Structure formats: C-alpha cells, structure tokens
Design a protein around this motif. Structure first.
Motif, PDB file in Angstrom:
ATOM      1  N   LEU A 151      -5.493  -5.896 -14.249  1.00  0.00           N
ATOM      2  CA  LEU A 151      -3.948  -5.138 -14.085  1.00  0.00           C
ATOM      3  C   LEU A 151      -3.494  -4.041 -14.873  1.00  0.00           C
ATOM      4  O   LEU A 151      -4.457  -3.693 -15.246  1.00  0.00           O
ATOM      5  CB  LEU A 151      -3.409  -6.911 -14.203  1.00  0.00           C
ATOM      6  N   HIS A 152      -2.279  -3.053 -14.588  1.00  0.00           N
ATOM      7  CA  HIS A 152      -2.241  -2.205 -15.092  1.00  0.00           C
ATOM      8  C   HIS A 152      -1.182  -2.409 -16.058  1.00  0.00           C
ATOM      9  O   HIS A 152       0.046  -2.340 -16.075  1.00  0.00           O
ATOM     10  CB  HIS A 152      -1.362  -0.925 -13.869  1.00  0.00           C
ATOM     11  N   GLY A 202       0.781  -0.426  -0.006  1.00  0.00           N
ATOM     12  CA  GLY A 202      -0.016   0.048   0.162  1.00  0.00           C
ATOM     13  C   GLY A 202       0.473   1.346   0.495  1.00  0.00           C
ATOM     14  O   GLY A 202      -0.045   2.006   0.877  1.00  0.00           O
ATOM     15  N   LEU A 203       1.671   1.937  -0.186  1.00  0.00           N
ATOM     16  CA  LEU A 203       2.855   2.716  -0.384  1.00  0.00           C
ATOM     17  C   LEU A 203       3.531   2.377  -1.874  1.00  0.00           C
ATOM     18  O   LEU A 203       3.947   1.543  -1.682  1.00  0.00           O
ATOM     19  CB  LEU A 203       4.174   2.433   0.900  1.00  0.00           C
ATOM     20  N   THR A 204       3.268   3.536  -2.210  1.00  0.00           N
ATOM     21  CA  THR A 204       3.821   3.962  -3.568  1.00  0.00           C
ATOM     22  C   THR A 204       5.192   4.041  -3.600  1.00  0.00           C
ATOM     23  O   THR A 204       5.967   4.660  -2.773  1.00  0.00           O
ATOM     24  CB  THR A 204       3.166   5.450  -4.232  1.00  0.00           C
ATOM     25  N   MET A 214       0.897  -1.478  -9.480  1.00  0.00           N
ATOM     26  CA  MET A 214       0.219  -0.212  -8.805  1.00  0.00           C
ATOM     27  C   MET A 214      -0.083  -0.451  -6.658  1.00  0.00           C
ATOM     28  O   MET A 214      -0.454  -2.068  -6.654  1.00  0.00           O
ATOM     29  CB  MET A 214      -1.378   0.459  -8.682  1.00  0.00           C
ATOM     30  N   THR A 215      -0.416   0.373  -6.392  1.00  0.00           N
ATOM     31  CA  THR A 215      -0.226  -0.824  -5.017  1.00  0.00           C
ATOM     32  C   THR A 215      -2.082  -1.012  -5.376  1.00  0.00           C
ATOM     33  O   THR A 215      -2.418  -1.142  -5.526  1.00  0.00           O
ATOM     34  CB  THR A 215      -0.968   0.720  -3.672  1.00  0.00           C
ATOM     35  N   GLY A 216      -1.707  -2.440  -4.498  1.00  0.00           N
ATOM     36  CA  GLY A 216      -2.784  -3.082  -3.645  1.00  0.00           C
ATOM     37  C   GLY A 216      -2.934  -4.561  -5.398  1.00  0.00           C
ATOM     38  O   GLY A 216      -3.118  -4.912  -5.121  1.00  0.00           O
ATOM     39  N   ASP A 217      -2.138  -3.763  -6.089  1.00  0.00           N
ATOM     40  CA  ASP A 217      -2.070  -5.149  -7.443  1.00  0.00           C
ATOM     41  C   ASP A 217      -1.313  -6.420  -7.248  1.00  0.00           C
ATOM     42  O   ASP A 217      -1.768  -7.455  -7.979  1.00  0.00           O
ATOM     43  CB  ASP A 217      -1.653  -4.345  -8.932  1.00  0.00           C
ATOM     44  N   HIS A 271      -2.181  -8.751  -4.858  1.00  0.00           N
ATOM     45  CA  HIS A 271      -2.943  -9.147  -4.676  1.00  0.00           C
ATOM     46  C   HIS A 271      -3.405 -10.035  -6.540  1.00  0.00           C
ATOM     47  O   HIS A 271      -3.781 -11.506  -6.408  1.00  0.00           O
ATOM     48  CB  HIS A 271      -4.228  -8.926  -4.651  1.00  0.00           C
ATOM     49  N   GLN A 272      -3.603  -9.287  -7.348  1.00  0.00           N
ATOM     50  CA  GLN A 272      -4.410  -9.727  -8.538  1.00  0.00           C
ATOM     51  C   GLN A 272      -3.095 -10.583  -9.422  1.00  0.00           C
ATOM     52  O   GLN A 272      -3.198 -11.481  -9.789  1.00  0.00           O
ATOM     53  CB  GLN A 272      -4.700  -8.101  -9.778  1.00  0.00           C
TER      54      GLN A 272
END
Ligand code: FAD
Ligand code: FAD
Ligand code: HCI
Ligand code: HCI
Lengths: 684, 684
Positions: free
Chosen positions: A452-453, A247-249, A598-601, A603-604
């Motif tokens: 996904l980004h 959760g930290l960029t 990205m932050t949170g990604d 898990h995806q």
C-alpha cells in the motif's frame, strides 16, 4: 448552510454511503451495539491506541455491556508510542498523541498556561464524515460548537503559481480580486469536468452510471434512495468506473479535461504567446497548485482518478474543527467513554509494548499470539481469543509477514536481527489467515498490505502574535487579513491559525504543510528526524530559516511597477525564535502520513477493506482483524480509521458466533454481507 | 556478443538515437568539436562539477582549442560539495564524489590499501549508452576492460515475493530451478506485451508506428536507417505514442497486459482459491517485484509508460562496469582531459562556493550574474558572458525561481532568510529568459523545473568476506553461489559485489538498494541523514541490524519441509561490524536520486530538454543554459547528464554566434534544429 454544532454536522452526513460500501451508512450501523456475543469471559488484544484501536475499544465496550451476568471482556491494549495519552493517565508532546492525532503544546514553562497548539496530524474534518461526527457526539455531545476550518478559500487567501497571483474567498468572482482570473476559469473547467452538475445536462468527462458524479453523490447521500440504486452502484456502476479508470491518474485526468476545454475555446491561450501544448500544460500545472479547497493537489497527481472521485463524492473539502483545545482530546474522551459504557463488564489494561509478531499457534483455547517488547526490550508473549491489529500498513508488515504463509511445526519468532529474544511457537499459522489450504491466499493479503502507498507529509510550525496579521504589509480582503497562502515556493500551503487556548494573543503559523514530492523536496532541511526540536526546550531555528528563505522571492502584483520581496517572507520572519518546529511523518515509524491509492492500488486496498469478511468462513477460525485508515477507502481521514474499526468489530462478532451473521444487528449486518467476501471457499 | 572493452561498448551504441531526439546520434555529434566561436576572450561559469558540468567543460575545451591566438575561454566552476574530487587536488568519502557519482572507500587506517568500494550513486552502465562510452574512451581509451554488471539474472539470483521463491540465472527455463515457474510465465507475458518481436508478427500491446517497440529499437540503433524513418519517428510516431500513452502508468500498463493474458488463459488462476481480480493482482505484483533485469520495478509503477518505453528501446538492463576502482575516477579523468584538450586556450578555476542566485542584470558586456557563498558564508558576485547551470532540478530551483518573471528595476538577491548578505542587482531579468514579453513563458520553464519528479533512493552497504559465499548455508545454483537477491522483505534488491581493489578477499554487500516507496519505508531506520555514519570512524550498526531483522523471515523452500529463517539473514549477519553504512539520496541536497517522469511529466521534462533552443532567437539576450540528467529523457543515467551537457554547449555556441546555426558542425546542428524550438523564429 454552515454547521455550527457537532449534532448539525452529524446529521448532515448520517446517511452518506461511500461507493465501495454503498449498501451501508456506517453511522446507522454504529447507532446501536453492533451485535451480540455468546456468554463467555473473552480475552481480546488491541494493537494500537490510535483512532482505529480506540474506536474498536469503544465498540467492544458497547458489546460488553450487553453480556449477561458472569460474562465479560478483558482487553489488553498495546501502545508503543511513549508519548501516547494512554501512558499519561517550550514544546510539549508527551501525553498529547493518539497516533496520528498529535498535538504539540507551545508554552513558557507552565503547560497549563500555553500559547498555542500545533495540530501535527489530523486537523480538519469533512462535514459529511458521518462516522467521525457520530463519535464526536459520543465524546462531546451534539450541542458542542464547531468552526469552519480556515482552508484556502474559506478565509482570505493568496495564491501564487509561476507569474500568477490571486487573492480570493470562495468561488464567486465577486469575491476574487481579479474576477477575470484564469485560475478561477480553470477551476470551473476542472470542476465541471470532474464533478459536473447535480441537475440538468451531464457535463462531466468521467461519468458514473452514465451521469455526472454530482448526481451519484446525491443518491449516496439520500435517506431513502433506491435500494435498487445502491446495489447497482455497489455491484455494477462503481466497479465499472474502477475497471475503466483505476489505471488513470488524477494528473492525466486533469490534462484530458483541460485539453478538451482548450480545443473548444473555453480556456484561451495563456499570454497568447504560449503554443497549444504550453498553454494546456500551464493550465494543468496552475490547477495543480490551486486545488479543490485544501490547497494544491499537484503533489497528489499520481493518485488514481478512482481515489480522487471518492473525495469528490464526499464533498471532502467542506471541513470543520472539533470542540477541543487539542484534537487528541477526542480520542482520549472516546477511550474514557469506552470504559464507562462497558458498565463494569469491560476491563482494560494498557501495555507500553511494541508488538513484533502475531500468529496463530498451539492447541489451547486461546491461539491468537502476540510477541512484544517493552521499553527496555524485554520480551513478552500472550495468547488471546481475538486480536484487532489497529496499526497502519508499514507498521503491520513486520508483525504479519515474517512467519511465512502456511502451517509450520515450530518457529522462533521475534526481532532476532536486533539482538532481541525470540519465542518458540508450535503448530504455527499466519495471523492473517485466509486459508487452511492456500499459501497464495495468505500471501495475497500480506503482500497487498506491504505494498500500500503511504503518502509522505510534513508540517512546519512556528508561533506568531496574531497581531502580526495587522502589519501594513499584510494584505486584506474587505478589511480581513489574508490567513491562508497556497504557493509554488516550496512551502505548498500555509495557514495562520488562531490559538485554541483562549481573540487569542498567539496563532499557530503552519508555515508549510506538504504532501508527497513537495515534502520530499524539503526533507534535507529538517535537521532532526522525525521531529525538530527533538527536545522540549529546543527550537528548529535553522530549519525554519530555510523556509523563510524559500519565501524570499520577488512577487509582482498587477498594477505595481516592480516586484518587492514577498510580504509572506516578512510574515514568516515575524514568528518568534523559540518554538520553531517541524514534524516529518515519513521518518516517524508510520513511514509517512496516510494511505493514498496509486493507479492499480484499488485491488490491494479493497482486499484489506474486505478482509474482515473472513469471519463468514466458519471452519477457518481466523482470530485476527485489522483496523486502520490503511485498510479503508478513506486513508488520511479519521473516517477511514473509524470505518475500518467498525469493520473489525463486526467481523469479530461474526467470528465469535462461528460465522453466524444473524448475531449482527439488522443495521450492522451489511458491514459484512454488503461486500464481496474475501474467502470464496468455503462459502457463507 | 558480450562487450569486453570500452571500445567494444562504445562502438555498439555509437549510432543509437533516443526517441525524443531521434534525428541525432549524440556520439556522432560529439566526434568533433561541436562548432566554432567568434574570436574573443569568453568568461563562462559552470555551476556544478558533476557529470553534466564536467562534460560541458570538456566540450568547452574542445571548442577553446579551435580559437585563434589571443582568444580563449576562462571557466569558473562552482562546486559546493566539500567531498568533491575538485577540492582534493573506516569509510572515506572525501574527494571521492563527482555529484551523484559517489564512492565510499572502506579501509583499515591506510586509504591507499583499502578493502572495498561502495558505489553509492552511479554503478551500472548500459551497453548502448553511446555518449557514456564515448566519454569513457576519452577518459580511459578503447582498450580498457569492462565487465558485465552482476544484475539479477546475470549471476545466480534468488527472487522472493510472497510465498513464491525462484532461483535462476538468465531467461532460459533450463536454468531456472522451477521451469514451470509462474514468474517466468508472467515475465514472458509482460515482455511480449511491452517489447514484442524484432521480426515477424507484431504482438505488443502498445505499438509505435503500428509496430512492436522491438522493431523501432532496431531502427533507432541502425547505422543507416531507412530514408525518412528518423524524421517520422521524431515528428510523428513518437509524439503520437506520447499523446496516447503519457497518461498511462507503468503499473496500469502491466495490469492491462496481464488482464488480457489471464482472459486468454496464458496465465492461470493462481491456485484453486483466488478469484479473477485476485489472480490478476497477484501476477501484476509478482512481476512488479521481479522486474526487467535490474530488480523490481513495482516502486517505479507510477512512471509514465513513455518513460519505461525509452528504457525498453535502449535495452537499458544490459549493463557493464567501468575500468576503475571507483567510478569517480571517470569524472576526474574527464576533468583533466578537458584541460588537456583545451591546448592552453581553456583556463579553469574551481570555486568552493554554493550558488544561491542567477539573473541577467546591468548594461555591461557580461550580464549573466551569479551570487554565491563561500565556506565562511561570505557573499560573492560575479558576471559572465555565458553560464551553464549543471545542477539537478531541486538544486536549480532556488537559483532561478526567486527573481520573478519579468524586468525588475532592482533586486536584493541572496539567501536573506538564512541571514546571509544580499547583493543589489539593477535592471534585472530572470536567468531562464524565454521571453522579453511574456511572464508566462518565463514562468513555464521555472515552474516546470520545480515540479519535475526526483525519484527517492537509498543504498545500505556493509563489508563481507567473499568466502562467506562458499559456506554451505549459501545456496549454489549452476555452479556458483547466489550473489543477487530480489525480495519483498523491504530490502528490495541486494548484491554481493566483489571488491574492485584486487579474487578479492572482500565484497561490497549492497544489502539494500531501494527506490521510491521502498526507500520511504526504510528511512525511519537510517539514524543519521543523509549518511550513517556521519564520521569516517563510525559504523551504522544499529541501522544495519534493522535491515538484518527485515531478513529474519521464515521462508519455505521446495527442498525442505521445515521452514527456517531465510538463509539471507545469515549472510547479512556475516558482514563485519565495522563499516556498516547507509546513504539516503533523499536527505542529500539533491532531494532524491534522479529524475523519473510521472504521467504528464513529459510536458515539463521535454521543455527542459529543449530549452537550449532559445539560442535561435537572436533578439533574446539569454545567456543561461542547463546541463543535468534532470533536463533529459534519461534521468538516472550518466547518458542523460551527458546529453544535456551536449545540448547546453550546442545552444551556447548558437547564442555566441547570435543565432547562427551554421556555427554548429554539420553533425551537431541537429542537437538544436532537430527539436521543436522553445521560441518561435522564422523558418530556415
Ligand atoms: C499529516 C496528517 C494529516 C492528517 N489530516 C487529517 C485531517 O485533517 N482530518 C482527518 O480526519 N484525518 C487526518 N489525518 C488522518 C488521521 O490522522 C488518521 O486517519 C488516523 O489518526 C489514523 O488512525 P489509525 O488508528 O489508523 O492509526 P494511527 O493513528 O497510526 O495509530 C496507530 C497506533 O498504533 C501504535 N503502534 C504502531 N505500531 C505498533 C506496534 N508494533 N505495537 C504497538 N503499538 C503500535 C502507534 O504508536 C499508534 O498510536 C491526518 C494524518 C496525518 C499524519
Ligand atoms: C542512487 C543512484 C543510482 C544511480 N545509478 C546509476 C547507474 O548505475 N548508471 C548511471 O549511468 N547513472 C546512475 N545514476 C545517475 C547518475 O549518477 C547521474 O545521472 C549523474 O551523476 C548526474 O550528473 P549531473 O551533473 O546531472 O548532477 P549531479 O551529479 O547532481 O552534480 C551536480 C553538482 O553540482 C553541485 N551543486 C549543486 N548545487 C550547487 C550549487 N547551488 N552551487 C554549487 N554547486 C552545486 C553538486 O555538489 C554536484 O557535484 C545514479 C544516481 C543515483 C543517485
Ligand atoms: O490534510 C487533509 O485535508 C487531510 C489528509 C489528506 C490530504 C489529502 C488527501 C486526503 C487526505
Ligand atoms: O539503478 C540503476 O540501474 C540506475 C538508476 C535508475 C533506476 C531505475 C530506472 C532508471 C534509472
């Protein structure tokens, strides 16, 4: 300690394990065929002829050679790109693409006698990319020579941010024009805070297993670490780092590091006129433009710290070239090698068709269906024993997301909104089949893929005489002209790369290589999308002039009385008129360049990285695997595409053996069992 | 409780103060002219005829009317957009743009009898946007009717994420098709966690002043807040929130909240098969697609929590329409009222010219220079007393960043890379002149502006008969057809908006309104950039069919066993063939839709927001002010452009009075003095 051959690079990274797959060295897993298949005549499809699909084909070829007499593998490879090397046996691109490994050949009417090559996609390969170098050895041999990629800092470099200018090589102050530079000071603070020290005191701000990342990198890269140490990283310490920092960029982390350094007095007030927050912000943004060895990571500041830390552990910036004129040769050679190694037991056919849908259907032996359209939009349907979907996430979405999430008695699949013909499938299940019972499990994999980004990227190229670098207004560092420029002009990162078709008369002037917002900001000027020129004979002259005009800036150098227009404007203007070029990956059908999380990604992407473990669930009987850098923890690297291919074929072997992991080699087994399974029920 | 007129909305938000400007209600500051100017005949330029430039013009008109006989203001307004309303004094756009307030008129050959309007840019206005409604009253009167914008949840809505479908109106579960929906549970979890309770116990996870944001919102909106509350928020509590949370993304915050709720049991495992991190991820992504009242904020998950919190405090989702056929009429009317309010003391001339450069130069009285190009690409140079740069940040960058950061003896400015004529300026200083002595100070403002984040956005429109919604294939919910669709199909958010040219025969089918990666993913299909069609007589049929095709998904509903193609496919396909359209703000010269701040960006955006305070330093001869939503804490809202205009004019007044803040009205003084200055000057 510079590697000089493919073999030297290969051996450098042979043991390296990435922190999401810390129990296995993929090069070690790939040394021998990945496993064994029961006797049979298999019909397999690979969707996509990029690095992932071709590596998967190679691994299948290796498996095919081990099959007994009377057995074999037939592969249909689907490749929609008309410019793919697979359909080929002024700026030329036809036959010079293997997905995102993409060359543009600049010539004057005879392509066998060209001026230079633009490497539009992949171009620079980390020393410790062990799977990449393993496949480069298959393709080219260990003896083949490699070069240091001419990154900022590897060759004489000019850096410009705001009012700051630097000219440098590497990180030794003796090699900087201003050894007292604030840029070199902020680099040391941010490196200290992110990477820390391999020996001695821990100085990093974000420890892993209570120690500096440098120390973990040494364990990940050891021949014989703790086994216990690798399991503890895999199951405890890296997951705990993710829990804390996903959760930290990166931008937030840089600002935290700079803040503490500024409060300690390690970084002084800027100009000593700026207040505390202006100073900290100036340093954050200065480091942002400067980077980690491949130009500014400011545009990447929204990635998670976890994603950046993967690159830190890997020493990602220490990169080399391949022993080729055009990088597409690597993938072409691997395709040919696949056919050679299959030793007659592998048969491959190429289809110039776009896959529109995948599903499981029917009651026949082969139930893995692909619906496709040829180049004149005629529909085709075929069923296979197994399918590897070797396309990145935005290209996979339409194929896997439009059939729903559970059994359906009948569906008319295809591109109906385009006016194209549909095909009726009966007794239909989703292709990415994680459950017979859960629509939610099936929806989780699809929805993760689709979100996904894809990082945005563009490359602006032109052709310039290499002798332009000898003009009196081109600065030198110890007699060598500046050949890399990192700037806040809008161009971001620029390189004057000698032609590989050879000292060469010409260079590829990579006038601007941009990521993310830096790319967004230019896109209105590209004119034609995704490529300007769209034709072989055009030139993107108007677009390129907008880039020259971004370089038309008054730059003050220390000691000089007055600013004059930047010399780099003059260099850019020296490019010839013909063969000016841009490629925008964002308006290519990839919908960008490559995945960055990205932050949170986590898990995806990690779900996708683990997807092939579905093969452990024997009754599930899912026939679809995925193989791309989008389904890895190295999006933007051939290493990621190759790792995902390895995962896909390993999973295919376990599936073909109805869940029996003993069918994998000893060395390959951890590809499946060293990850958390994606199916909790049923076990296996 | 629903506002029904401009005046009702105006009065509702008249007191609201934003947390970065908490000491001042902008509508209260704007109730009278902002201040006084010395007698004189002022030459002012406004670069840009959008909401910011026109509001600045209006405020200059109010000031002009106060000048004595013989005095006056002359404004040259520069406007490069050939479709601006300023230059006009099947799909038609000519004359229907005021920057990002942008209408497309659909007609059949007579534009005075059109079918519908596509609102390509701004379209929905928060109730508490007090300055917006203040200017709307100047333009239309308090009595003019407004309507609730038909957001998801304001009208019957279908929501689709993965395997989840909801049909609903409001947040009362009685009016959800499934009162046990997991979507409604996660929405409550995220509301409790982010907003909390206006009374009683504090339940929010990210407090401000140790209390729930809901309580702070009420303070900020109070006619008569408690003594010291606004000062403490401005100087202590909001800065402390920023210090704690500007490094936290919205997506990270959502996951933290969901994780706690999952651990508490408020959110159950998704079905029997998902593991813990899978279920958490499912809920995060479900909420991501659902949103806060204006569709999914998943694409906005990288914004700082600070940025989302500004929108929470503002109750941003509670929005209305304007009393117009086309929103551009608002800005046009404000331009005409600016001239009226000037009382003959304001003279305005429009220049159809693109500004390429700004600087200070020379020794004459009027030292603020603008270099521009007309429609024949001929150069023009003009000097002014003061300049308001009313363009967003990517358009501003070339104008302010190419002149260096300190004095220069001479510069040949202009678009030399384009081959266009330059102009020699002598004794040159940068336009955004924060310091006479610090290039770093000057660099901070420039580099900040150039690194602000322009959110990407696109809108796909078509024309449909309103009676299409009465077909049996369109679902009805609580007495009305579904008119809003929020989905993970790639379309993101879709609206069937009644034509304002009128129950109307036609509706504007906003088939897809996308942000950020949602927009990236579509862009390869747009065909022509930034607008398809590029002509008045064409139709973006091929493009639109790719959107229809994204809707060709088998959707399982609770009310039927045999899933069928999504009904919304059929609705999209019901749109007529003519007048299919897309506009991509990313390939427009704005390089996107509007500013949204990433983690860390406060430091850059807030520098821009505070820039006009340079006027406090009397010894600093800086004549340039900035006026756009890019230079506000409400990027993406007219409110931000209008707040920035108010700032710009307040600063101009202080500069024109050589630093004397007493020249501002009592109510407008805090526009300058309520902010941390960008230049250090003595107390009091
Ligand atoms: C700007 C940029 C810079 C990069 N720089 C580097 C670098 O320096 N070093 C490095 O190691 N890596 C780099 N990479 C990353 C590298 O290029 C990728 O990791 C790798 O090439 C991806 O391979 P893939 O097989 O995952 O996907 P792709 O290369 O995207 O291949 C997928 C293939 O599938 C085909 N296809 C897609 N959809 C369908 C369909 N529906 N039906 C049929 N065929 C279909 C495509 O045409 C394509 O050929 C870079 C990439 C880019 C774009
Ligand atoms: C997709 C989208 C959705 C939005 N939705 C909403 C909404 O529902 N509600 C809301 O309140 N707001 C919304 N907004 C935001 C609102 O449109 C903007 O805040 C406001 O219009 C911005 O005004 P501005 O003056 O800052 O800039 P702009 O509108 O960008 O105006 C700048 C002007 O300067 C001109 N210009 C630029 N560069 C030059 C140059 N070099 N020389 C000369 N002229 C130049 C341009 O042509 C333009 O007319 C939306 C915007 C978009 C794009
Ligand atoms: O350009 C590169 O070095 C490879 C692509 C990339 C860029 C930034 C982060 C990861 C991968
Ligand atoms: O579409 C809107 O509601 C206005 C633009 C916008 C979108 C998302 C966040 C802020 C502003």
């Amino acid at each position: 300690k510079i590697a000089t051959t493919v073999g030297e690079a290969r051996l450098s990274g042979i043991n390296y394990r990435h922190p999401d797959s810390a129990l296995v060295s993929y090069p070690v897993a790939a040394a021998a065929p990945l496993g064994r298949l029961p006797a049979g005549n298999y019909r397999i499809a690979i969707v996509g002829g990029g690095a992932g699909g071709i590596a998967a084909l190679y691994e299948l070829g290796r498996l095919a050679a081990t099959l007994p007499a009377g057995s074999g593998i037939d592969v249909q490879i689907y490749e929609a790109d008309p410019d793919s090397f697979l359909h080929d046996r002024a700026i030329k691109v036809r036959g010079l693409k293997a997905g995102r490994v993409s060359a543009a050949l600049v010539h004057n009417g005879d392509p066998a006698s060209g001026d230079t090559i633009y490497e539009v996609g992949a171009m620079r390969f980390p020393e410790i990319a062990g799977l990449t170098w393993h496949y480069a050895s298959a393709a080219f041999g260990d003896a083949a020579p490699i070069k240091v990629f001419p990154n900022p800092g590897k060759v004489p470099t000019e850096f410009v941010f705001g009012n700051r200018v630097d000219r440098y090589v590497g990180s030794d102050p003796k090699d900087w024009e201003d050894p007292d530079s604030p840029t070199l000071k902020v680099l040391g603070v941010v490196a200290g805070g992110l990477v820390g020290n391999p020996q001695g005191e821990n100085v990093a701000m974000y420890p892993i297993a209570n120690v500096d990342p440098a120390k973990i990198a040494a364990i990940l890269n050891a021949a014989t670490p703790p086994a216990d140490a690798l399991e503890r990283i895999q199951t405890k310490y890296w997951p705990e780092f993710i829990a804390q920092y996903d959760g930290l960029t990166l931008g937030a982390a840089v600002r935290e590091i700079v803040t503490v350094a500024f409060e300690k007095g390690t970084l002084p007030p800027v100009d000593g006129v700026l207040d505390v927050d202006e100073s900290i912000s100036y340093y954050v943004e200065l480091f942002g433009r400067f980077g980690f060895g491949t130009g500014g990571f400011k545009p990447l500041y929204n990635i998670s710290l976890v994603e950046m830390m993967r690159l830190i552990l890997w020493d990602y910036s220490n990169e080399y070239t391949l022993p080729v004129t055009e990088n597409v040769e690597f993938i072409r050679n691997l395709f040919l090698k696949a056919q050679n190694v299959g030793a007659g037991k592998l048969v491959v056919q190429v289809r110039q068709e776009r896959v529109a849908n995948a599903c499981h259907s029917g009651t026949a032996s082969a139930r893995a269906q692909l619906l496709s359209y040829d180049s004149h939009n005629a529909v085709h349907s075929e069923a296979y024993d197994f399918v590897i979907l070797a396309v990145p996430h935005d290209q996979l979405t339409p194929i896997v997301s439009r059939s729903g999430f559970e059994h359906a008695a009948s569906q008319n699949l295809g591109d109906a909104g385009l006016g194209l013909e549909t095909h009726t499938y009966n007794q239909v299940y989703p292709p990415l089949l994680l459950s017979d019972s859960s629509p939610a499990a099936n929806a989780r994999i699809v929805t993760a893929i689709g979100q996904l980004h894809m990082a945005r990227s563009s490359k602006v190229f032109a052709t310039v005489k290499t002798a332009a670098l000898d003009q009196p207004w081109v600065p030198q560092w110890r007699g060598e002209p500046i050949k890399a420029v990192v700037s806040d002009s809008g161009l971001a990162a620029s390189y004057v790369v000698p032609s590989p078709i050879v000292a060469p008369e010409y260079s590829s002037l990579l006038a601007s290589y941009t990521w993310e917002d830096d790319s967004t900001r230019l896109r209105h000027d590209f004119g034609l999308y995704p490529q300007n020129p769209a034709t072989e004979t055009g030139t993107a002259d108007g677009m390129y002039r907008t880039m020259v005009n971004r370089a038309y800036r008054y730059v003050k150098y220390a000691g000089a009385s007055n600013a004059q227009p930047w010399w780099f404007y003059q260099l850019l203007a020296e490019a010839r008129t013909a063969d000016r070029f841009v490629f925008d990956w964002t308006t290519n059908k990839t919908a960008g360049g490559f995945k960055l999380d990205m932050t949170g990604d986590h898990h995806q992407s990690n779900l996708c990285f683990r997807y092939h473990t579905h093969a452990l669930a024997a009754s599930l009987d899912n026939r679809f695997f995925i193989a791309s850098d989008s389904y890895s923890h190295l999006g933007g690297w051939l290493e990621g595409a190759f790792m995902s291919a390895l995962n896909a074929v390993a999973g295919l072997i376990v599936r073909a053996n109805r869940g029996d992991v003993s069918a994998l080699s000893t060395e390959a087994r951890p590809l499946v069992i060293g990850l958390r399974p994606v199916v909790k029920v049923p076990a296996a």
